[PDB]
Amino acid sequence: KRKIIYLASPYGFSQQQKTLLLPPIVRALEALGIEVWEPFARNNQIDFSQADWAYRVAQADLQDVKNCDGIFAVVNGTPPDEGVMVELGMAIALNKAIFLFRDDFRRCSDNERYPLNLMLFAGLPEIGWENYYYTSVDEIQSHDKALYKWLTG
Amino acid sequence: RKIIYLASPYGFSQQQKTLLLPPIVRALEALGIEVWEPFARNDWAYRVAQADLQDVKNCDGIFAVVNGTPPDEGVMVELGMAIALNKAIFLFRDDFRRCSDNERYPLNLMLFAGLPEIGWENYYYTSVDEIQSHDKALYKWLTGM
Amino acid sequence: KRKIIYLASPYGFSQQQKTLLLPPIVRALEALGIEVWEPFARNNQIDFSQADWAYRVAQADLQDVKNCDGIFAVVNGTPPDEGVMVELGMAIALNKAIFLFRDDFRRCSDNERYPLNLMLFAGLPEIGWENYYYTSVDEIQSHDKALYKWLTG
Amino acid sequence: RKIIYLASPYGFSQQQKTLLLPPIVRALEALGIEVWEPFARNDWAYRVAQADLQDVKNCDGIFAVVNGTPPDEGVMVELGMAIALNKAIFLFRDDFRRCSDNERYPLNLMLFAGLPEIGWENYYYTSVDEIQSHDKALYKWLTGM
């Protein structure tokens, strides 16, 4: 009954980023009563002596995306992370809730409407997509943006 | 004819659009495939996004050009949609660089989530001339082997 | 006495790109009478059974950049290639001639003046940098752009 | 004091600027280093470019944060300038992904052009806490070993 957010990000690949950037985002989401599924913690911390470990991580992330209610995708970087992008496309196709996070002020784009490749916004409305687009950790709990509105009906 | 959506970044560069895509299209068409190439098939940005999304919904498989470090973010979104929609999945990379978070695969392990654990290499093409190989997955998919 | 251009690019990493995109660029430069040093052909085609081969390639590229008269840097991609970027910085610091090539229409930038990271343009003039910036292979031989002007005095 | 130019992409992200850079600065400052961090030290775009270029000309060494796939293109330009200007060169990467064209190095081989053939690993730091190691190159450079 508690809504589940899959927190897709590249922050687990860097020690500093994993330790310092992910917990404030997890906490902002948990403070809204969300059950946060963070895949590096949930799925990558495995026995890497097993020949099949990478396949198993992929399948676990896949199943989590299928079972979540929404994705909160950290799309920082030039370009955004290729694994996050796969998960985002999965979420779009599965009609999950979609929320994007980018506090990187660079633009990496093929168009004038969006700060990123237009296909990242294919699951968002033509008008008002900005309401689903978070540019700071402090913005996540805003009652005037889409994540909070989704939680309150 | 089976329909392949040819996802790539090659339309972003004038020279690459002109020279890199037609050999790939020709290779696919020689297997009897109807190729949907989105730069040719294409406010305007939202419309392109919806057109590409509908093409992925309506294809039978995706042939994803995943060259680059990292692979193209738009192609990745389409690959994820294809995986979730149970489309056939084929990957192409003739870029010899590694851009990876693991030792099993040459790329980020999530890109292979739609492929089997054993024999994923059969779906992974590393030259244009490999596309027609009757030992690899595209041929087998077209003929029911 | 013939001027030497170091042709920095990522096109050698892809079979199709190496075979199809590089030769028309080499030919456009050679048609201007330039001696073209293309590092994948010059330096990477080595005995890779030698433990030191990667070190030797790096040193050979380094020496070529030191000995060239100018760099023609293919800065396609989002972002541009990290090895090309190192060579570009080397060329800037060594007061070589600088010419940039990008026919990729995407923008990958931290600013409103330039289509790329502003630091790529640090070796070019504040006003008129566009004269050193080529957006098509057909433009390379233009007598109104900087490469041709450099060759003719 | 020896002057280190701390080249990084971390100023591009609000959270990364706030949380990632100060621990690195602190680690360097504990070795007695004067740290030049360009986002803090900074038409406007050309002026930033010239300021960064002069800082690299005037530093004694560069400490280049080369996280990401690929590493940041601006950092790479500064690294190349530092190599050509005979500055001391130190690399930092706590990103465990490989983005490379070879098997010897974890990154594109050209990034290591300013480092020796044997012992380049001594100049390559893979955690913040490694920065102070008295067995690695930064310490030795500061003390003449």
Author numbering:
A (entry chain A), C (entry chain A): 2 to 154
B (entry chain B), D (entry chain B): 3 to 44, 53 to 155
Publication excerpt:
Here, we characterize the structure and function of a thermophilic dNDT, the protein from Chroococcidiopsis thermalis (CtNDT). Nucleoside 2′-deoxyribosyltransferase (dNDT) enzymes catalyze transglycosylation via a covalent 2′-deoxyribosylated enzyme intermediate with retention of configuration, having applications in the biocatalytic synthesis of 2′-deoxynucleoside analogues in a single step. The reaction catalyzed by dNDT proceeds via a ping-pong mechanism, with the formation of a 2′-deoxyribosyl-enzyme intermediate covalently linked to an active-site glutamate.13 Transglycosylation occurs in a stereospecific manner, preserving the anomeric carbon in the β configuration in the newly formed 2′-deoxyribonucleoside.
The structure of wild-type CtNDT was solved by molecular replacement with PHASER. The overall structure of CtNDT is similar to that of T. brucei nucleoside 2′deoxyribosyltransferase (TbNDT),61 as structural superposition reveals an RMSD of 0.859 Å. Wild-type CtNDT was used as a search model for complex structures.
